[PDB]
Recover the amino acids of this structure.
């Protein structure tokens, strides 16, 4: 069904869907709710409706995502990470800032504090931008006929890399092993790191009467 | 001032743009806003009225893992051509209609400044820009532009600055075109593909001479010294070189030394520098900035300091972190003008000694994540420090008594060290905003003298020491702590009394203290924004049913291993960990139903709870581990227990009972018939993993 709690989730087979209202206090008079629609094989479909207004209009309110569960392995031993994601978005009125992005967290050990974050931004609506120390892209890389600009930034004690798409990608199909291999070869990512989390979801800033529907989502680690 | 034509033109330009974050709100046709000069971004002339500056530029504000900019979306109207005397035009961060640069910009006939950098312009650069004869500053960097012909540059004979970074650069003869600008000083060509387009010696020979000062050549896959050698045709006038993120794999070029007037060298984020600064340095004499971060230098630190000996009186910032440097930090105060020094995450196995007395101007220092030994130096030799991080080292000895002479310190982190004691001067800091001395072997007792004058302390972290904290009665604390982290610290036989005047604190970890007193009456209400409450392994007694009032920020409640008694406290609507084992509670737990709870871990084992389990567990589907063992429950189990699809553990033994995937463990011993969960929202966006080493 549909659940509106702050930390509530739905654990299905080989998938977990969160609401993650982790910064709801930064805004006033907002709400959000996520729900799963159909699960079949390795494909999951879901939706997320929200309405956030006012408050700190320059902060992420939530990261309602659909994460994958897998046996943690080092980046060396990962052969391929196939992924697909088809989504549609429906906002209304004006002053709409949001984001759609993959998040991959890697650390030194199997269960450790997140040392490296890799975000893949398939859409940047209304001024949403990645973390960047200099505010400027540091690499331009093409993976599978998809262009990306790479940003590097600090998050406490974590290094965040960001691949922002040059154009909006509403239908994505790729192998994320290429991104990690590029990062290890050029950007200095250690190859012995353990990939602990892989997920994808939205990140609203300010939006009224908004709803995002993921018609299909798949991921695996080989 | 404010001739009506300019006001009409500016209003027409406003009409096209679609502002959404309050910008341009000062503009309007209302009689109250008639005067043009007072508008934001509009500057006029004193004698005449035609405006001189139009600076509608924005800035980035950044959060945990995102940044935002109030970009102006709209159409750039041609009515700006009514600005016949304009010379400043800065529309940088706004994203307009993501199309080609407007052509009418070439017809301003008085422009002297133009900054369209970091907008979302695309397409070819307009060819009419040859009409901008009077331009001096031109910034068009980091847009999705395509540049393959630079024939328009030859007619622009007044530039002192040209930024063309972040473009699909394909001009094979760019050096010849750039050289045609006699007065060029600073050149920005970062993020271009300059690796594929290296100038030839013949065309460098067939060129004029122009005195460049600052070079910003970053984000090109150079990877060798043979692809950027051309910049050594500028040794006479070079003053700043920025060569970061170039995947350089080799020795730093020896010709970087002997570059007179050099003041800013950036070589951060390379592949392998293989020895760091060579012997060619020490001839610099004017260096003021040197960033060699994350480059795998593998250099001996005293060798680097002796090779940087030329710029002792001028070097200000020295970033040398995320490298692999070994040795001992000796004689750092001989650098008169040093203000920042970063040496995080190295293989420094040495000492931190001064061995001679001279003051230092360092304001920022961090030596964390190393293997440094020995005692701390006389910290009174660093009077102007503002931050000081020395965590994860092997430092020993007491903190020197001069620590109280800083008078400007804001952060002091000495965690994960083998420090033995704390001095009495710690109170006289008066501007410390955070103090972390956790995981040290700290002995002795801390009286109020150590805390006498910290009127700005917000963070107190003395976790896991042999320390003691006894403050005299009738003491009025001068600080309002927001995080209180004092585990395994002897806070006294009685409940601490300095907590009465403490408000507005987010977490409270006073567990493993030796409190042997009942809950005081004055401790009746926690602050509204309380987040973490841990009172485990104490001897506190009383009733907590009147202490938890369902705040909206609760995440962790740990009142285990105490002498609490009474009805079960109200469970917060957003709590996640709820540990209450080893106490003396009693009664039914029917009050776990009236509100929806997002708890992921609750433990009620080793109490005297009796009665029947409520058939209301559908209201808490977030449960992972459930423990009701060693209690005195009775009656049939609720069928709603089958609705906890997220359960991973269910311990119910030593009871009097009668009568869901991922349930790894199912213990139902007696009753007459390592696991790891996730607490999300701990480190802001990041989650935290909690391991439950449950018994069997
Ligand atoms: C055309 O228009 C465009 C508009 O887009 C213009 O572009 C803008 O131009 C302005 C200037 O006009 C720029 O503003 C300036 O920014 C700089 C940079 O600030 C950022 O970096 C700081 C330093 O970072 C190092 O240090 C920090 C820790 O201190 C560390 O975390 C970093 O990772 C980094 O560390 C690296 O270096 C170390 C030392 O070498 C190494 O050890 C280490 O290993 C690394 O290698 C940083 O401090 C600063 O922090 C700010 O932001 C964070 C996050 O938001 C915030 O938390 C902080 O509180 C700070 O607010 C930034 O990250 C900045 O130094 C300049 O400061 C001047 O102005 C202030 C104003 O008060 C003065 O006080 C200063 O003394 C100084 O004079 C200035 O703000 C802007 O960045 C730039 N933007 C873009 C997108 O281009 C363009 O210039 C225009 N062109 C023309 C011709 O006009
Ligand atoms: C404000 O307007 C005055 C008047 O035009 C400008 O002063 C003129 O400047 C030009 C160029 O230097 C001279 O040829 C004129 O002789 C000056 N006028 C007078 C009366 O002497 C002035 O420069 C303008 N302000 C700015 C900032 O440009
Ligand atoms: C630093 O500059 C000096 C000059 O001030 C360089 O000295 C030259 O090279 C050697 C040095 O052993 C000697 O022949 C002379 O001192 C100089 N040669 C002349 C004048 O022809 C010195 O080489 C520079 N440092 C480095 C590492 O090259
Ligand atoms: C805590 O520090 C403050 C700093 O303002 C001290 O307040 C004054 O300090 C000056 C010295 O700079 C003395 O001349 C004043 O007599 C102090 N005023 C008061 C009311 O004490 C303050 O004294 C310090 N705390 C203690 C206990 O000395
Ligand atoms: C589960 O939680 C809901 C909501 O917290 C409870 O709903 C309450 O039901 C009673 C009896 O019908 C009403 O008097 C209250 O007004 C309801 N509260 C709200 C907030 O709607 C419900 O009783 C709980 N238990 C079960 C088994 O559903
Ligand atoms: C550029 O200058 C030339 C030379 O006077 C002139 O003929 C042309 O009209 C100018 N361009 C524009 C757009 O005014
Ligand atoms: C070499 O320089 C001369 C300077 O007079 C110039 O005329 C000539 O065009 C240059 N050679 C080439 C190939 O451009
Ligand atoms: C410029 O560098 C080249 C290197 O190929 C050199 O031949 C030439 O003499 C230099 N010109 C100077 C230093 O004026
Ligand atoms: C209360 O704490 C907050 C930090 O969350 C701080 O911003 C605020 O200034 C504090 N107020 C007082 C009166 O200490
Ligand atoms: C509470 O503190 C004790 C010791 O100080 C620790 O073992 C326990 O894990 C803490 N509670 C939580 C929820 O982490
Ligand atoms: C403090 O508590 C510890 C552990 O319970 C105990 O060993 C020690 O004797 C106590 N100290 C005093 C002074 O009672
Ligand atoms: C608290 O309980 C423990 C064991 O249940 C007991 O040994 C101790 O005496 C109790 N404390 C008091 C003050 O009675
Ligand atoms: C525990 O429950 C039993 C019956 O199941 C009964 O003796 C009484 O209610 C309780 N006794 C004690 C000692 O707690």
């Amino acid at each position: 069904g549909d659940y509106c709690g702050q930390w509530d989730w739905a654990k299905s087979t080989n998938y977990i869907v969160y609401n993650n209202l982790w910064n709801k206090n930064a805004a006033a008079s907002g709400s959000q709710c996520t729900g799963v629609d159909k699960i079949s094989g390795s494909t999951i479909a879901w939706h997320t409706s929200y309405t956030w207004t006012g408050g700190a209009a320059t902060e992420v309110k939530s990261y309602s995502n659909a994460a994958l569960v897998f046996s943690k392995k080092q980046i060396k031993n990962i052969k391929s990470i196939p992924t697909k994601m088809k989504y549609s978005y429906s906002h209304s009125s004006g002053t709409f800032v949001a984001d759609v992005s993959y998040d991959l967290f890697t650390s030194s050990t199997a269960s450790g504090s997140n040392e490296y974050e890799i975000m893949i931004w398939l859409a940047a609506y209304g001024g949403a931008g990645p973390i960047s120390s200099t505010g400027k892209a540091i690499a331009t890389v093409t993976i599978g006929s998809n262009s990306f600009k790479l940003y590097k930034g600090p998050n406490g004690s974590t290094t965040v890399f960001s691949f922002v798409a040059t154009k909006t990608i509403t239908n994505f199909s790729a192998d994320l092993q290429k991104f990690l291999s590029y990062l290890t070869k050029n950007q200095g990512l250690p190859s012995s790191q353990y990939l602990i989390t892989l997920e994808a979801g939205t990140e609203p800033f300010v939006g009224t009467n908004a709803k995002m529907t993921v018609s299909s989502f798949s991921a695996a680690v080989n | 001032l404010c001739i009506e034509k300019e006001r009409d033109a500016l209003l027409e330009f406003k009409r096209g743009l679609s502002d959404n974050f309050g910008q341009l709100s000062t503009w309007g046709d209302e009689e109250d806003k008639k005067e043009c000069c007072k508008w934001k971004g509009i500057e006029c002339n004193k004698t005449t009225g035609h405006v001189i500056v139009l600076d509608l530029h924005n800035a980035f504000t950044c959060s945990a893992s995102a940044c935002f900019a109030p970009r102006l979306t709209g159409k750039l109207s041609p009515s700006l051509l009514e600005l016949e005397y304009l010379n400043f035009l800065d529309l940088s961060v706004n994203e307009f209609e993501r199309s080609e640069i407007p052509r009418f910009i070439c017809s301003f006939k008085r422009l002297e400044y133009l900054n369209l950098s970091s907008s979302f312009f695309s397409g070819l650069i307009p060819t009419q820009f040859k009409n901008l004869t009077s331009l001096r500053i031109l910034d068009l960097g980091y847009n999705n532009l395509i540049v393959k012909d630079l024939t328009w540059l030859s007619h622009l004979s007044s530039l002192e600055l040209l930024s063309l970074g972040g473009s699909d650069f394909q001009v094979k003869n760019w050096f010849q075109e750039i050289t045609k600008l006699p007065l060029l000083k600073e050149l920005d060509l970062s993020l271009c593909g300059l690796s594929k387009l290296v100038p030839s010696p013949a065309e460098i020979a067939n060129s004029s001479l122009i005195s460049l000062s600052v070079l910003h050549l970053c984000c090109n896959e150079f990877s060798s010294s043979a692809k950027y050698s051309w910049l050594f045709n500028f040794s006479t006038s070079l003053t700043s070189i920025d060569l970061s993120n170039n995947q350089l794999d080799g020795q730093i070029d020896d010709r970087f030394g002997n570059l007179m007037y050099l003041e800013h060298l950036n070589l951060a984020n390379e592949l392998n520098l293989k020895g760091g600064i060579p012997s060619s340095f020490g001839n610099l004499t004017r260096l003021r900035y040197l960033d060699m971060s994350n480059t795998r230098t593998y250099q001996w630190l005293p060798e680097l300091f002796v090779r940087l000996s030329g710029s002792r009186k001028t070097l200000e910032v020295l970033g040398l972190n995320d490298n692999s440097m070994f040795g001992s930090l000796v004689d750092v105060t001989r650098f008169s003008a040093l203000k920042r020094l970063y040496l995080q995450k190295n293989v420094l196995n040495g000492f931190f000694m001064e061995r001679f007395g001279q003051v230092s101007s360092l304001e920022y220092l961090d030596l964390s994540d190393n293997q440094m030994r020995g005692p701390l130096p006389d910290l009174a030799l660093f009077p102007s420090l503002r931050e000081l991080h020395l965590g994860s080292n092997h430092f020993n000895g007491r903190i020197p008594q001069g620590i109280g002479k800083l008078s400007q310190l804001k952060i002091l982190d000495v965690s994960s060290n083998r420090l033995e004691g704390l001095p009495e001067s710690m109170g006289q800091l008066s501007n410390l905003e955070s103090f972390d001395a956790s995981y040290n072997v700290l002995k002795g007792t801390i009286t109020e003298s150590h805390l006498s004058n910290l009127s700005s302390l917000v963070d107190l972290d003395l976790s896991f020491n042999s320390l003691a904290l006894k403050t005299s009665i009738d003491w009025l604390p001068p600080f309002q702590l927001q995080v209180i982290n004092l585990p395994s610290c002897n806070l006294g036989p009685s409940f601490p009394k300095w907590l009465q005047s403490q408000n507005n604190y987010t977490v409270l970890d006073i567990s493993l203290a030796n409190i042997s007193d009942a809950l005081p009456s004055w401790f009746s209400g926690l602050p509204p924004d309380i987040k973490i409450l841990n009172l485990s392994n104490n001897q506190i007694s009383g009733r907590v049913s009147d202490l938890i009032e369902n705040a909206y920020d609760y995440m962790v409640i740990d009142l285990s291993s105490n002498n609490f008694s009474g009805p079960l406290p109200l469970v917060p609507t957003n709590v996640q960990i709820f540990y209450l084992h080893k106490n003396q509670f009693f009664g039914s737990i029917s009050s776990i139903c009236k509100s929806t709870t997002g708890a992921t871990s609750l433990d009620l084992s080793h109490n005297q709870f009796s009665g029947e389990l409520p058939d209301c567990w559908m209201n808490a589907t977030n449960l992972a581990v459930l423990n009701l063992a060693y209690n005195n429950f009775s009656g049939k189990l609720p069928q709603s227990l089958g609705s906890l699809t997220n359960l991973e553990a269910l311990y119910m033994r030593q009871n009097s009972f009668s009568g869901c995937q991922s349930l790894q463990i199912l213990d139902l011993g007696g009753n007459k018939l390592p696991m790891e969960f996730l607490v999300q929202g701990f480190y802001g966006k990041y989650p935290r993993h909690y391991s439950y080493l449950g018994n069997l």
Summary: Chain B touches chain A through 51 residues (CB under 8 Å). Residues B 608, 610, 632, 634, 656 surround 2-acetamido-2-deoxy-beta-D-glucopyranose (ligand 13) (CB under 6 Å). Helices of chain B lie at 4-16, 174-179, 201-205, 301-307.
